[PDB]
Amino acid sequence: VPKTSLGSPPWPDIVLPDPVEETRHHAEVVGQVNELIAAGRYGRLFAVVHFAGHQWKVTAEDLILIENELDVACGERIRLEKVLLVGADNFTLLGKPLLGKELVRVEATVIEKTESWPKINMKFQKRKNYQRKRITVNPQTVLRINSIEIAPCLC
Amino acid sequence: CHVARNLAVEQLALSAEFPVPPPVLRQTFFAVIGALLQSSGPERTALFIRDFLITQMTGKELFEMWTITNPMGLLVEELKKRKISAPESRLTRQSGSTTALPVYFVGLYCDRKLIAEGPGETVLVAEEEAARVALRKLFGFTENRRPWDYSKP
Amino acid sequence: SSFSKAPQQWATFARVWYLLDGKMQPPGKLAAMASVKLQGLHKPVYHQLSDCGDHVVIMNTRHIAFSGNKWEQKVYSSHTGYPGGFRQVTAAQLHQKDPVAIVKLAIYGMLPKNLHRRTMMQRLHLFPDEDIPEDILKNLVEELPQPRKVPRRLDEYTQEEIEAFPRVWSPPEDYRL
Amino acid sequence: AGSQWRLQQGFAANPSGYGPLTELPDWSYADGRPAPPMKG
Amino acid sequence: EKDIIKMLGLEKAHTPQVHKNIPSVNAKLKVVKHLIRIKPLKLPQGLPTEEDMANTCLKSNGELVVRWLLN
Amino acid sequence: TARGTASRFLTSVLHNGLGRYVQQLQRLSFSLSRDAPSSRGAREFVEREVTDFARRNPGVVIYVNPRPCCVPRVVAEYLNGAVREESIHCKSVEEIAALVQKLADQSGLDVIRIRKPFHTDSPSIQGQWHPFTNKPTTLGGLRPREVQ
Amino acid sequence: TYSSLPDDYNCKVELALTSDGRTIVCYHPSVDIPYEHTKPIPXXXXXXXXXXXXXXXXXXXXXXXXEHLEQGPMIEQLSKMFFTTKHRWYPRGQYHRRRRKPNPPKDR
Amino acid sequence: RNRIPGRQWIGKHRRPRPVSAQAKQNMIRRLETEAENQYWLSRPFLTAEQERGHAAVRRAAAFQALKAAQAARFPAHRRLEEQLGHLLVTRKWS
Amino acid sequence: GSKAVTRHRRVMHFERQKLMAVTEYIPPKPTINPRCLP
RNA sequence: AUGUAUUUUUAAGAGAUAGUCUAAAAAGGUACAGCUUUUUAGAAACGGAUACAACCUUGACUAGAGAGUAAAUCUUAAUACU
Ligand SMILES: [Mg+2]
Ligand SMILES: [Mg+2]
Ligand SMILES: [Mg+2]
Ligand SMILES: [Mg+2]
Ligand SMILES: [Mg+2]
Ligand SMILES: [Mg+2]
Ligand SMILES: [Mg+2]
Ligand SMILES: [Mg+2]
Ligand SMILES: [Mg+2]
Ligand SMILES: [Mg+2]
Structure with a gap:
């Protein structure tokens, strides 16, 4: 097998380190990070949060509008639970496909229960004489994310 | 002014000229502050003040309010x-x-x-x-x- | 991360000047990426109603490579609008007359067909050889990878690699070459 | 996409179906009071 | 064909349904076999007792699980 | 229709709910007739429910006037300076109740197309994308064809 | 000492996986730009507007520039400046100016 | 300048459209699923006489529920509280 | 409509064509060519 | 049998009874029609066949700044006789 434009697969060859070296390297990296967390040196967290059928990018102090009614008294403080991603400037924590509750916590507040503005759904036919007009209103709920809190523990 | 306006303080205030020219509004607001200071501890008014004022700094910059040229x-x-x-x-x-x-x-x-x-x-x-x-x-x-x-x- | 507002936004939507070398490249495979970069589709901030498109300078335009016999059978047509004013031209001829044309038509025909094509057609600069106003030289940000790996002629190979490749067949001595 | 691989591992075709994703009750009261259950 | 499918309760697509593996039914399934996907049920933990009714889930490999999500 | 109306981004009144949540509803003014049938539901509501609702919500004032009126009405007013008008006209007690509770939980903000569901200040933690961000620099910071 | 992508740019990037296995982690410190890869700041300021005889005459000589062209030519240069076509640069009609939203909404 | 006579897809002369590699794939995919199907349909649990009347109990009972369903249709009870409750219409303060 | 037998070769309905393209003859393909074998 | 919920009757009713193509079996015609004539099957999407009535994918509601898929993007090759 000499070097012909075919005989050599046209793409860079692959090397992945031995799993033991990587196990060490990993425990190392995780530890270092866990020390950044123990320290509290992360400035501001964001987290990608699954909620109410959607995914959102959440940071503290902010606002999202949920399309369905949630039963909570206005003003209640609420622990969002499903968290896919977490992040901070230096480093980032990723759920498969979720994070342990103990690993992170996000507390948001329900701000406003409301009704959506009128939407207009109109079906129509050509010269079959069929119009149907409907006006729809959707119950909506606005939450303010209060705090993203990250606890030290990771292994 | 903006804040006290949204807290319905302008609404409640006794003064001539209903639009409540801004200085009088400042005075009145801070007056409710000091009255809280007498009716409840400094520790309480601390909470209040950090809620309805500090917040207004949210999103704002440093050199936004510093103006240094x-x-x-x-x-x-x-x-x-x-x-x-x-x-x-x-x-x-x-x-x-x-x-x-x-x-x-x-x-x-x-x-x-x-x-x-x-x-x-x-x-x-x-x-x-x-x-x-x-x-x-x-x-x-x-x-x-x-x-x-x-x-x- | 922390920037004031006016500068921050100016940074995000900042136009860029890209350079792309054409010597020995298919006008097609060139115009593909040329068009990408023109529409602004390399920028994750991209949006259609947003003006983003980046300048593109292609150089060594005369040195286009055409796969197949395409030089011979691809014809470019156009019409004056006058009766019998219709014009069919072999690609070879056209490029002979005006080096720039071939590539320009590729890129043109490759954009969406709305108005902004006309406008992004403006940010496209096309040079037959490498001769560029030091104006346009000055503002060049970055070089793009050549979209095809050009085959070397026989004469490029080091004798090391010539010897390195094994002799496949042993010729008879008697035979004359 | 990615239905295939998901299937071969034995998950749902769709990440919405029957995964822990959908199953868990995504909010609680901060007090710890378990939230009223979900219609889905 | 339509009505085979109607009397199989196969009305709504991409939805699993269960049936006897007896031949009486295989008549029907044989009629529509190009419209459908059949796969054998499997019961690894075995059959649900009454206690396990609210906990039973069905995995796409064609398997039934009795205890779903312990604590 | 979208292009018909105004819009507003999603927002808080006075950054409400951040430090402490403050019910944005200020006062309610019911106007009904002791006599007219049109007000029937709203009479019963005034009897039974109003009392307790008031206890539910200290922050709101409730002004209830029987007057010779033929169309029962309730007017919400908000700290936002905003005012909203309503008819309680010919509704049940259940109905009224639900509606007053609607008014209770509103921003006072206007009902208009809300451009996107998320209001975020400084979404950009750890950076905000700019063209160069993923480009490797060269030695001397030279151009593509520049020489030294 | 392995990352899939060069640490040339942005962040040096560390992927890792929890010994549990239910969590991926990432350590990404910003990679700052080397002093070698930098070139000096351009400094150009030159004033010849000063005439040796009278310097008020000379400092009134930098306020002495201004000019007038026609609509067509000006538009051409304008559009050769910012690399737009000649179209963007024409006025809009009365009806079209009327309907520009008087008070447009602002985020942030 | 090359035209199609008449209607595109209809007559004795048609727009030619060719099979796609994609198409070959889709078809094979379906064939696969159906080969598997007619496998799983091959080997029944019970035999034929084995399944004779094996729920004759349930099948008549469902039908007695179905019968019993229409058994029950009669006009609805009418109560005092309706006829009289219509007078709450005029309920007054005085 | 065209009769089941014609002179002119009769365009097939698409799905039948699909069926053809699937059922094409495939010749056994050797591991190593017999001629280039010893 | 079995899988399903239909079917028959009784009291009232109207419209409709001027059809198109698509696969199939047949006749007529020129083994011609976007042709005509019957029988059995299908359809008449806001998705795909660029465009499209009939072909293929799918049957349906209301809202989401969610996800999974379906049909489908377009290919296939032709040299001496010393
Ligand atoms: Mg259905
Ligand atoms: Mg035609
Ligand atoms: Mg035709
Ligand atoms: Mg026919
Ligand atoms: Mg007719
Ligand atoms: Mg008739
Ligand atoms: Mg016909
Ligand atoms: Mg029919
Ligand atoms: Mg279409
Ligand atoms: Mg549906």
């Missing part, structure tokens, strides 16, 4: 106070010089370490903004900074 000089002074010597402006990224809309990135270096960097429409305004940045990281007012605490000790 020579970032460069202040930078060198605060550096002097840090026992750090000489901010050195050195150009990093540039797209177009013949453009009507060129872009510059001027980096600021202390002892060949990069302290901060900034974008701009001219090399001048770039130096300016990289300086803004440097100042921000120095003082700790930075987007990345821990968002403010709200808690009940």
